[PDB]
Amino acid sequence: KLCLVCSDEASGCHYGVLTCGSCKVFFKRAVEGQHNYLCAGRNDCIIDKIRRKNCPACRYRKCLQAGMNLEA
Amino acid sequence: HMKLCLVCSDEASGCHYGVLTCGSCKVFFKRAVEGQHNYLCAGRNDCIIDKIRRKNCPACRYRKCLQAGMNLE
DNA sequence: TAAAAAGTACACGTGG
DNA sequence: ACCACGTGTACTTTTT
Ligand SMILES: [Zn+2]
Ligand SMILES: [Zn+2]
Ligand SMILES: [Zn+2]
Ligand SMILES: [Zn+2]
């Protein structure tokens, strides 16, 4: 089973979406915080296990488009 | 009129490893050349490297260091 | 007596 | 919670 945000090994159904632990914690942190992230490319970065660290802007966007939300 | 880092356009501090750079790019290059680091670009290998965004893509930042001529000797 | 460039070390923030 | 890791500033050493 695979995190729909980064393709790492999923941990569970977190905030609506099958995701890994790091993406779960990441999303909670992004929402619940003054987080003004800026993409260095084209707001279309690749989010896999390594690259996910590179662009929190695109990882968060992808969290959202995947449907994550703090309310179930 | 102040000196600009040829890698990231922050204010340079001096000529480091052959190239006019900021302190941050001086030590970033040294670390990249001496350590073995798996840098991948999440974009198209043309990410914007400025003071605000240089942390996002080490792979592109290192490539620009190289292209600019930085060398450890 | 000093500037430039190289080396070293501490604090910090994000991430897992 | 807690530690690893990348980063950037500031300091010291070496160089000229
Ligand atoms: Zn994930
Ligand atoms: Zn991006
Ligand atoms: Zn720079
Ligand atoms: Zn890049």
Side-chain angles (χ1 to χ4, degrees), chain A residues 2-72, chain B residues 2 4-73:
Chain A
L2 288 201
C3 166
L4 293 160
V5 171
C6 76
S7 286
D8 203 352
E9 184 170 1
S11 173
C13 191
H14 301 288
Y15 306 118
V17 180
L18 179 72
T19 61
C20 60
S22 79
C23 287
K24 162 212 172 76
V25 172
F26 169 88
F27 179 67
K28 171 67 148 185
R29 284 178 179 156
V31 184
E32 191 162 353
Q34 163 168 318
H35 269 301
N36 311 323
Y37 295 136
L38 175 60
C39 176
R42 298 165 166 85
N43 276 340
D44 191 11
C45 290
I46 296 153
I47 307 307
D48 56 40
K49 176 170 195 174
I50 291 150
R51 294 177 245 244
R52 75 188 178 194
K53 185 175 172 217
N54 284 15
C55 194
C58 285
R59 181 184 193 183
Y60 185 28
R61 169 160 34 258
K62 179 169 179 195
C63 282
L64 292 177
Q65 293 174 11
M68 301 185 68
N69 186 321
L70 288 198
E71 301 292 356
Chain B
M2 108 258 29
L4 294 184
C5 179
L6 290 177
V7 168
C8 84
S9 307
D10 205 11
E11 182 177 354
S13 56
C15 184
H16 305 287
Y17 308 119
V19 179
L20 176 63
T21 59
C22 68
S24 73
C25 292
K26 157 191 147 58
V27 78
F28 168 82
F29 183 72
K30 198 209 191 185
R31 278 158 182 160
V33 168
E34 289 177 4
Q36 299 174 349
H37 289 156
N38 179 33
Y39 293 151
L40 308 163
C41 177
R44 304 178 194 177
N45 296 294
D46 60 359
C47 298
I48 299 169
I49 306 296
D50 55 16
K51 171 171 189 168
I52 288 178
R53 287 175 273 189
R54 65 194 171 199
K55 305 189 180 186
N56 293 25
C57 193
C60 271
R61 184 186 196 171
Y62 180 67
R63 162 180 60 74
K64 286 189 70 179
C65 285
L66 290 183
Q67 274 168 6
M70 299 188 70
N71 65 109
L72 206 65
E73 312 288 315

Coordinates of all heavy atoms in Angstrom, one line a residue, chain A residues 22 29 52 59, chain C residues 13-16:
Chain A
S22 N 5.0 10.6 7.3 CA 5.7 11.9 7.1 C 4.7 12.9 6.4 O 4.7 14.0 6.8 CB 7.0 11.7 6.4 OG 6.8 11.6 5.0
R29 N 0.9 20.0 9.9 CA 1.7 21.1 10.1 C 1.5 22.2 9.1 O 1.4 23.4 9.5 CB 3.2 20.7 10.1 CG 3.6 20.0 11.3 CD 5.0 19.6 11.3 NE 5.4 18.9 12.5 CZ 6.4 18.0 12.6 NH1 7.1 17.7 11.5 NH2 6.6 17.4 13.8
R52 N 10.0 14.9 -2.3 CA 8.9 15.6 -1.4 C 9.5 16.6 -0.5 O 8.9 17.6 -0.2 CB 8.2 14.5 -0.6 CG 9.0 13.9 0.6 CD 8.3 12.8 1.2 NE 9.1 12.2 2.3 CZ 8.9 11.0 2.9 NH1 7.9 10.2 2.5 NH2 9.7 10.6 3.8
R59 N 4.1 19.8 -2.5 CA 3.6 18.7 -1.7 C 2.3 19.0 -1.0 O 1.4 18.1 -0.9 CB 4.7 18.3 -0.6 CG 4.4 17.2 0.3 CD 5.5 17.0 1.3 NE 5.5 15.7 2.0 CZ 6.3 15.3 3.0 NH1 7.3 16.1 3.4 NH2 6.1 14.2 3.6
Chain C
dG13 P 14.6 28.9 14.6 OP1 13.8 30.2 14.2 OP2 14.3 28.2 15.8 O5' 14.4 28.0 13.3 C5' 14.5 28.5 12.1 C4' 14.2 27.4 11.1 O4' 15.2 26.4 11.2 C3' 12.8 26.8 11.2 O3' 12.1 26.8 10.0 C2' 13.2 25.4 11.7 C1' 14.6 25.1 11.3 N9 15.4 24.3 12.2 C8 15.5 24.5 13.5 N7 16.3 23.6 14.0 C5 16.7 22.8 13.0 C6 17.5 21.7 13.0 O6 18.1 21.1 13.9 N1 17.6 21.1 11.7 C2 17.0 21.6 10.6 N2 17.2 20.9 9.5 N3 16.2 22.7 10.6 C4 16.1 23.2 11.8
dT14 P 10.6 26.3 9.9 OP1 9.9 27.2 9.0 OP2 10.1 26.0 11.3 O5' 10.8 24.9 9.1 C5' 11.6 24.8 8.0 C4' 11.9 23.4 7.6 O4' 12.7 22.8 8.6 C3' 10.6 22.4 7.5 O3' 10.6 21.9 6.2 C2' 10.8 21.4 8.6 C1' 12.3 21.4 8.8 N1 12.8 21.1 10.1 C2 13.8 20.0 10.3 O2 14.2 19.3 9.3 N3 14.2 19.8 11.5 C4 13.8 20.5 12.7 O4 14.3 20.2 13.8 C5 12.9 21.6 12.5 C7 12.4 22.4 13.6 C6 12.5 21.8 11.2
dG15 P 9.4 20.9 5.7 OP1 9.6 20.8 4.2 OP2 8.1 21.3 6.2 O5' 9.9 19.5 6.2 C5' 11.2 19.1 5.9 C4' 11.6 17.7 6.4 O4' 11.9 17.9 7.8 C3' 10.5 16.7 6.4 O3' 10.9 15.6 5.7 C2' 10.1 16.4 7.8 C1' 11.3 16.8 8.6 N9 11.1 17.3 9.9 C8 10.2 18.3 10.3 N7 10.2 18.6 11.6 C5 11.2 17.7 12.1 C6 11.7 17.5 13.4 O6 11.3 18.1 14.4 N1 12.7 16.6 13.5 C2 13.2 15.8 12.4 N2 14.1 14.9 12.6 N3 12.7 16.0 11.1 C4 11.8 17.0 11.1
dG16 P 9.9 14.4 5.4 OP1 10.5 13.8 4.1 OP2 8.5 14.8 5.5 O5' 10.2 13.3 6.6 C5' 11.4 12.7 6.7 C4' 11.5 11.7 7.9 O4' 11.4 12.5 9.1 C3' 10.3 10.8 8.0 O3' 10.7 9.5 8.4 C2' 9.4 11.4 9.0 C1' 10.4 12.0 10.0 N9 9.9 13.1 10.8 C8 9.0 14.0 10.5 N7 8.7 14.9 11.5 C5 9.6 14.4 12.5 C6 9.8 14.9 13.8 O6 9.2 15.9 14.4 N1 10.7 14.2 14.5 C2 11.3 13.1 14.0 N2 12.2 12.5 14.9 N3 11.2 12.6 12.8 C4 10.3 13.3 12.1

